[PDB]
């Protein structure tokens, strides 16, 4: 069996120009490890960016699933 948090989910990241980028990942991934893959897809570094889900900033150490980030969940991207 593949347990909860280790199936592919596709998270939608939304920038300040209304562009969407889809990142395939696992619910068990930390926000930090999510940012690492995101950054390679969008041409930045994790330390240059902030992610928010519906108003609140996501902390690097905490998992996507703990923030209730699921397949097709939208996140808002900001650059420092």
């Amino acid at each position: 069996l593949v347990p909860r948090g280790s199936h592919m989910i596709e998270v939608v990241v939304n920038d300040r120009l209304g562009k969407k980028v889809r990142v395939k990942c696992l619910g068990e991934d930390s926000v930090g490890d999510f940012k690492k893959v995101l950054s390679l897809q969008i041409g930045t570094q994790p330390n240059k960016i902030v992610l928010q889900k519906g108003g609140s900033v996501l902390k690097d150490h905490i998992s996507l699933e703990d923030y209730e980030v699921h397949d097709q969940t939208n996140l808002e991207l900001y650059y420092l």
Binding site: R22, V23, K24
Partner: peptide, 21 residues
Amino acid sequence: SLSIEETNELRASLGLKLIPP
């Protein structure tokens, strides 16, 4: 913007657990 296969190349490089097929 990327397939599971391509995403996994990135994950593997970063030492993360792979996304199941």
